[PDB]
Amino acid sequence: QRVTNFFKEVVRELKKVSWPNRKELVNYTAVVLATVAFFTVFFAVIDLGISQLIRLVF
Amino acid sequence: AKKTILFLLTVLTTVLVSGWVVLGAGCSGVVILKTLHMFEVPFLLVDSPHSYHSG
Amino acid sequence: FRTISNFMRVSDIRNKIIFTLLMLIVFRIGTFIPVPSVNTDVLFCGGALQNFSIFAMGVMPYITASIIVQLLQMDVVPKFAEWSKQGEMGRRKLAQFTRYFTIVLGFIQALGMSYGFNNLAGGMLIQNPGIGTYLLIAVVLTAGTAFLMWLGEQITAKGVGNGISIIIFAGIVSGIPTILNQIYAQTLNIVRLLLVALAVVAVIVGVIYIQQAFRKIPIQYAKRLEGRNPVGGHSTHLPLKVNPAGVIPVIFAVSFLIAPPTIASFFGTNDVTLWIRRTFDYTHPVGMTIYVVLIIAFTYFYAFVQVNPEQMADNLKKQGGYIPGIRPGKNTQEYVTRILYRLTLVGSLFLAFIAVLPVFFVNFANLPPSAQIGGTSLLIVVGVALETMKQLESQLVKRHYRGFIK
C-alpha cells in the first residue's frame, strides 16, 4: 500500500526539480561532444607522433 | 549504529587497494582492470555588521 | 563557435589552456615509458594494453585516500572530525594527511599490482622476480603517482580547472582511440554500430539532463530582513543534486563484487571457488542483480554521508535561516531527509542503469569486451567536461563589464 503512495510522491517530487531547458541541454551536449572529439583526436595524434619518435630514437 | 557500516566500507575499499594478490584467473569477468578507470575526486563536505551614518 | 574563439582571443584563458594541453602532453609522455625490470614484449590477456607504465597506478590511490579520509571524518577518528571543524587550517592538515595517505597507499597498491602482474603473464613478465625489484618498481610506480599529483596541482594552479579531474579525463579519453582502432579492425554490422552511436549520444543527453538538475529548497534568513523588494530571480536557496554521490557507489559496489573472488582464489580451487567465480560475475544475470542492489544501497548510504540532513539542519539552525513554514530543529531534518529519499531513488536508478549499460552494449553490438563504452567513465567524462566549461565561462564573463556609457 505504502509503496504506491511513495512512488506517487516520487513523481510529485520530480516535478519540483529544476531541470535544464532544451537550449542549454543542446548547448551542453555540443560542449561535451566537441571536447570528447577534440581530446580523442589530440591523444591519437600525440600517441602516433611520439610512437614514431620512439621508433626513430630507439 | 553507523560507525560499524562506515568501518566495514573502509575495510572493503582497502581490500580494493589490495585486490591484486591474484590477477591470474586470462580475460574473464574481472572488473579490477576495468575499475582502473572509474573514479572521480569526491566532493568535499560542508559577528554583527555595522555602518557609518553620515550625521 | 563564439565562446571558443573568445577563449582564444583572451590572453590569460588561452595561456592557461595552452599550459593545460602541455601538461597533458607530459602525462602522455610519461605513459609511453615502461617500468625498468619488466619485459612487456609479450604482446596480452585483455584490457591490459599498455597498463605497465610509470603511471600504471594512475591516480587510483589518491582517489582511494580521499574517499578513505572523507569516510573517517564522520566519527571514527575524532581527531579527523576536529580537523574538519577547525576551519581552513584543519582542512589544510587533512589535505597534508591525504598526501601522506596517498603516498602510503600508492606504495601498497604498487606492491600488490606488481605481484599480480607477475602472476598474470605466466611469470615471464618480470625478470628476476625477487622482493628487491618489487620494492624498486613499487617505488617507481609511487613516484609516478606523486608526479601525477604534482601535475594535478600545477594544472589547477596555472591551468584551467581541477587537476585530478583533468588527469582522470585524460586517462579515459586517451583510452578511447585504441578502442576505436579495435572497432575498425573488428569490422548489418555498420548499421548496428550506428545504432550504438545513436544510443551513446542519447545516453549522454540523459546524463546531462539528470546531472545538471537541482532541487531548489527555498530558504528564508532571519538576520537580514528583505527591506527592499527584489527582482526575485536570484533568491537564496539550497540546491540538492539528483545524484548527490557521483560515481563513488560504483567503486563501493565493485569492491564488494570483486572481494569474494579474490579471497576464493586465495583459498584455492574447490567447488565453491567455481561457484563463487560463476555467481559473482556481473556479466551474468545473477551477478548483475547483486551489482545493481549493491549500487542502490551504496548510493543511499553515500548520499546520506554527503548531504547529511541532520548536520545540515543543525547548520541551518545554528546561523539564522530556515525553510519557510518549517521549524528549524528536527522538522527541517525530517523534511530534507524525505526530499533526499525521493531524489536518491531517482539518481540511484540512474546510476545503476548507467553502470550496467555496457553489459547490454557488448551483448548487442558484439564489441571487444574490454571496451566498456557507455559506463561510468562516461559519467566522469561528462562531469569533467561540463565543470571545465563552466570554469572557463566564468573567467570569460568577468571581462564582460559594460557600463551604461558603452
How far apart, in whole angstroms, are the C-alpha atoms of residue C165 and residue B39?
9
How far apart, in whole angstroms, are the C-alpha atoms of residue C152 and residue C168?
10
Contacts of A10 in chain C (CB under 8 A): 342, 345-346
How far apart, in whole angstroms, are the C-alpha atoms of residue A33 and residue C382?
9
Closest listed residue to residue C39, CA positions, set C162, C130, C126, C122? C126
Domain-located, residue C235: yes
Question: Which string of b and e fits B6-31 if b means at least 16 CB within 10 Å?
Answer: beebeeebbbbbbbbebbeeeeebbb
Query: B38, C58: Cβ pair inside 8 Å?
Result: no
Of C184, C199, C231, the last residue of a domain is C184
Q: Where is C394: in which H helix or E strand?
A: helix C376-397
Domain-located, residue C394: no
Contacts of B7 in chain C (CB under 8 A): 76
Query: C173, A9: Cβ pair inside 8 Å?
Result: no
Considering CB atoms only, which of C105, C115, C255 is closest to B15? C255
Q: Are strands A17-18 and C237-241 parallel, antiparallel or unpaired?
A: unpaired
Look up residue C123 and give its three cell numbers: 611469470
How far apart, in whole angstroms, are the C-alpha atoms of residue C80 and residue C2?
47
Half-sphere exposure (CA, 13 Å, Cβ side) for C363?
Answer: 8
How far apart, in whole angstroms, are the C-alpha atoms of residue C332 and residue C317?
9
- Same domain for C143 and C1: yes
Q: Is C326 exposed, middle or buried (0-12, 13-18, 19+ CB in 10 A)?
A: middle
User: For residue C206, what are the domain limits?
Assistant: 187-374
- For the residues of C207-220, what is the DSSP string, one character each? HHHHHT-EEEEE-B
C-alpha of C237 from chain center: 27
* Way the structure was solved: cryo-EM
How far apart, in whole angstroms, are the C-alpha atoms of residue C61 and residue C44?
25
DSSP code, position C57: S
Half-sphere exposure (CA, 13 Å, Cβ side) for C378?
Answer: 26
How far apart, in whole angstroms, are the C-alpha atoms of residue C281 and residue C278?
6
Domain extents in chain A? 1-56
How far apart, in whole angstroms, are the C-alpha atoms of residue C178 and residue C44?
14
Q: Is C326 helix (H, G, I), strand (E, B) or coil?
A: strand
How far apart, in whole angstroms, are the C-alpha atoms of residue C280 and residue C256?
10
How far apart, in whole angstroms, are the C-alpha atoms of residue C56 and residue C32?
10
Compute CA distances C174 → A40, C25, C32, C119, C311, whole Å: 7, 11, 12, 27, 40
CB distance C6 to C396 below 8 Å: yes
User: Which chain A residue shows the shortest CA-CA distance from C340?
Assistant: A13
Question: Which string of b and e fits C247-282 if b means at least 16 CB within 10 Å?
Answer: bbbbbbbbbbbbbebbebbeeeeeeebeebbeebbb
C287: CATH: 1.10.3370.10
- Same domain for C357 and C226: yes
- Same domain for C193 and C124: no
How far apart, in whole angstroms, are the C-alpha atoms of residue C83 and residue C73?
8
Other C-beta atoms closer than 10 Å to the C-beta of C61 total 27
Contacts of C239 in chain A (CB under 8 A): 18
- Same domain for C129 and C103: yes
Contacts of A9 in chain C (CB under 8 A): 342
Question: Measured over all CA atoms, what is the biggest interatomic distance in chain C, rounded to whole angstroms?
Answer: 83
CB distance C311 to C382 below 8 Å: no
Domain-located, residue C399: no
Domain-located, residue C43: yes
Look up residue C27 and give its three cell numbers: 602525462
DSSP code, position C404: S
Of C140, C160, C184, the last residue of a domain is C184
- Same domain for C77 and C170: yes
- Same domain for C248 and C146: no
Other C-beta atoms closer than 10 Å to the C-beta of C68 total 19
CB distance C160 to C16 below 8 Å: yes
Q: Within the 220-259 window of chain C, which residues sit less than 8 Å (CB to CB) from chain A?
A: 239, 242
CB distance C384 to C165 below 8 Å: yes
Per the rule left: phi > 0, alpha: psi between -120 and 50, beta: everything else, C87 is left
What values do phi and psi take at C323, rounded to 5? -100, 130
Domain-located, residue C398: no
Look up residue C398 and give its three cell numbers: 568577468
Q: Which residue of C101, C125, C262 to mutate against B (max B Cβ within 10 Å)? A: C262
Closest listed residue to residue C253, CA positions, set C219, C225, C295, C220? C295
Sign of CA dihedral B20, B26, B32, B35: positive
The strand pairing partners of C218, in sequence order, are C237
Query: A25, C381: Cβ pair inside 8 Å?
Result: no
Q: Which long-range contacts (CB under 8 A, 24 or more apart) does C236-239 make?
A: C236/C321, C238/C312, C239/A18, C239/C214, C239/C215
